[PDB]
Symmetry: none
Subunit: 146 residues, 4 copies
Amino acid sequence: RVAVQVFDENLNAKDVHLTDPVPTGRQIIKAAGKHPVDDYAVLAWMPDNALRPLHLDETFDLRQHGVERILVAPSDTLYRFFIDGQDQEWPVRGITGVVLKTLAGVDPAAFEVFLVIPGDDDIRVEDHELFDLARKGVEHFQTVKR
Amino acid sequence: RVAVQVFDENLNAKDVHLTDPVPTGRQIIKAAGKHPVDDYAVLAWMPDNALRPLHLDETFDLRQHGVERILVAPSDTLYRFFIDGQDQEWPVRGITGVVLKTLAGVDPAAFEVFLVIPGDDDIRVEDHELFDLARKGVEHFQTVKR
Amino acid sequence: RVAVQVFDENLNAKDVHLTDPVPTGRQIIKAAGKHPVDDYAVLAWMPDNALRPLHLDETFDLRQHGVERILVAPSDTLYRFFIDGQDQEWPVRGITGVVLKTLAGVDPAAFEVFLVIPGDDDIRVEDHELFDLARKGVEHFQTVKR
Amino acid sequence: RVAVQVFDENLNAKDVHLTDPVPTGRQIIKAAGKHPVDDYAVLAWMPDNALRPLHLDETFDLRQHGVERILVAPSDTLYRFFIDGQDQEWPVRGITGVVLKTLAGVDPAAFEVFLVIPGDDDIRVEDHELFDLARKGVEHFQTVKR
Ligand SMILES: [Ca+2]
Ligand SMILES: [Ca+2]
Ligand SMILES: [Ca+2]
Ligand SMILES: [Ca+2]
Ligand SMILES: [Ca+2]
Ligand SMILES: [Ca+2]
Ligand SMILES: [Ca+2]
Ligand SMILES: [Ca+2]
Ligand SMILES: [Ca+2]
Ligand SMILES: [Ca+2]
């Protein structure tokens, strides 16, 4: 019985055990106890903090060392954004600054995340400020040392 | 010099040659001659007609048999939808019915694509009708024989 | 003496006690007091509302926590159908809408079950309407919120 | 890469290789190259010649010794019948006598399969005679030595 960490839009971990060593996205969503399956987007959180979308029939090999990270969220569209030069797709419409800094792999307290707008003033997203990713265009976030 | 087929939101193929046998998404976007790189979403079109998103640093192994299929489109968000039970993410806001039926792997003329609304009348998308995927909720498309 | 809930085509529970902790389908049919054994189909009703057929020699482990659910019905053929994307086999030829919504795990009053016909009008099955599953093809039922 | 034998209503084997050690019925149907998934019934052919239905989300552990046997057939209903006292469900409406004797585990040439009708004359099914299982009632087949 392998184990994984199912997250949410707030990056709250939730250990879930699966008998299948190599389950599909549908199996992971079933294990998360979220229904219907078609309404939820699942992304594999790679060790380098990269969110790669996983499809309902795409298998994720859990038969490795360590507990894998999976982010399952109720979503109908994935919004693209850049955090510290890393491309990501967030399933949900709004993202908190603490989540952005966690994705950047930096200390939430020691760093401040800024939406970088070249030529204009950058917008500082607070730790618990739900910045809306629905804004037109790809969002470039950078974590400046506080 | 490997070769790939770069598509668009209209699924118009465009053969592009790359020296790198295993290039990244950034290299593919550069080869497509589309700038800036950050504004374009690239999806690998798998042989089973599955669009899997590819990231700017994720490598795509082109050193295989046959010409691989890549879809590069100017996009800031990926809209999720189901076509014949297959999960897909479309980079662009609008999709034509001919593209939907091509993704379904069926003859565009012999089939008609319907947005299935359980309990209500299904919406028939015409061959050159640009259905908007921005509609709230995941879209379920099914290709009924004409 | 373990206990189980023997159901019927109307999903009417009936507590039955068995001395054998791990009885076979034949033993369960005998405990249900239904003769001859060969004319009755038995399905284990899994906790996730999945009906999995059980054979006369296949053992069902009752030595677990909670009372298990068994559906025993006079049947010569199992008709396949999809309810909310879940595959099921109904032993009897006709199924009531209340049974469909119970299988879907939703409130019978708050939801309405529809036979989904892509491209055509969906057929609303009433709560006590005995829809015939003998219709050619696999039936796709979806419970829309009322 | 594990391997399985995908059969059909004529019990024609077809070796198929799967990367997933423990795939679901949906994965097996995908590997068989049969679409749509919802129209096909899959049954695990147990070593004792027992056909046990497998569901689209039910996992089949292939990580064992020997090549497992899977029967995938286009089916909307499973017809129940007894062959040599063994309960079976045939996905397709018609079954050939050679298939019946193969299920009985006996030599097709050395044995003759009879539909046993108590009190009346038993009906001998020929080797390549497509007996219809749609006949009302459970069919009891017995293989008498020729
Ligand atoms: Ca698996
Ligand atoms: Ca600035
Ligand atoms: Ca955005
Ligand atoms: Ca390279
Ligand atoms: Ca949508
Ligand atoms: Ca026992
Ligand atoms: Ca409809
Ligand atoms: Ca039917
Ligand atoms: Ca006789
Ligand atoms: Ca029959």
